[PDB]
Structures are given as structure tokens and as C-alpha cells.
Amino acid sequence: GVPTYGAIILDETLENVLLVQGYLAKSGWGFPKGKVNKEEAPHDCAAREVFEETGFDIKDYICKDDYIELRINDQLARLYIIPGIPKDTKFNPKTRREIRNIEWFSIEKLPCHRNDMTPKSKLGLAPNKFFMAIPFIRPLRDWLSRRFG
Numbered sequence: 525g526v527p528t529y530g531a532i533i534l535d536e537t538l539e540n541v542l543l544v545q546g547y548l549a550k551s552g553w554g555f556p557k558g559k560v561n562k563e564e565a566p567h568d569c570a571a572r573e574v575f576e577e578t579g580f581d582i583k584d585y586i587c588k589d590d591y592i593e594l595r596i597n598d599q600l601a602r603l604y605i606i607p608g609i610p611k612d613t614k615f616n617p618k619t620r621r622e623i624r625n626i627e628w629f630s631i632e633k634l635p636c637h638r639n640d641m642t643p644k645s646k647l648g649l650a651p652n653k654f655f656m657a658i659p660f661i662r663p664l665r666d667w668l669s670r671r672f673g
């Protein structure tokens with residue numbers, strides 16, 4: 525699978541994260557990210573995708589060693605951690621044919637797993653609008669505990 529790159533943007537209090545909502549198969553909330561172009565460096569891909577999806581330029585704030593990376597279904601997604609961005613920043617996608625909405629979310633209120641259906645004696649997981657973000661939540665909380673406190 526082609527690698528994807530993006531960002532986890534936090535505010536100045538470290539208790540809110542910026543998520544974006546797409547359409548159709550990307551109809552829920554997730555971190556801004558996308559697929560790398562041929563010959564494009566990881567940091568340049570992350571900045572390009574975040575600016576296309578949010579209108580905010582991270583290039584002068586990326587730190588090379590500060591990211592969370594996951595391999596899901598043999599595809600690799602790497603999100604650079606960007607703290608300290610003011611909550612009154614004006615965010616605007618480049619293409620609203622791809623992005624429905626942009627919002628801050630409390631990290632402590634976000635889910636870190638989906639719920640089962642054991643009350644119905646049925647296998648699988650119940651739907652949740654944060655499905656694309658959920659895999660990053662626990663590793664982000666653990667990263668923030670080790671780096672800050």
C-alpha cells in the first residue's frame with residue numbers, strides 16, 4: 525500500500541486535537557493526511573496534505589523525530605505531532621469537494637476503541653464516527669505522557 529503522511533495538531537493546553545471530516549468512504553472524523561507522491565520526502569508530503577485539507581502550514585513547526593506511525597493492513601501511516609497551535613486559528617480547506625468540516629475535539633472524551641455488540645450476542649463492532657482516528661488515540665496519550673507529563 526502507498527505510505528500516507530499527515531499531522532496531529534494540538535492546541536496550547538495540550539487537551540484538544542484538530543480533526544477533519546470527509547465524504548462517502550471518508551464520511552467520519554480523522555487526522556489530516558494523504559498519499560505520498562513519487563520522489564516526495566515524508567515531511568513535504570505531510571505539509572502538503574495538511575495545507576490542502578486545513579489551510580494551515582506546518583512546515584516551520586515539524587520536528588523530525590516527533591511522530592506516531594502505524595501499519596494497518598500492510599499500509600504505513602505516519603502523523604507528525606504539532607503542539608501549541610492557537611485555538612482561534614482560522615482553518616479553511618483548499619477543496620470543499622473533499623472536506624466537509626474541521627473541528628477541535630477534547631482528547632480525553634475521544635474513544636480509544638469501538639464498542640462490541642455483546643448485548644445482541646452478535647459478532648463484530650458497532651459503528652463510530654471516529655473510526656479513522658481511533659487507532660492513534662492510545663499511542664498519542666502515551667506519547668504525550670512520556671514527552672510532557
Ligand SMILES: CC(C)C(=O)/N=c1/[nH]nc([C@@H]2CCCO2)s1
Pocket residue numbers: 551552553650651652653654655
Ligand atoms: C454519520 C457519519 C458521521 C458517520 O458516522 N459515518 C461513518 N461512516 N463509516 C462508519 C462505520 C463505523 C466505523 C466503521 O465504518 S461511521
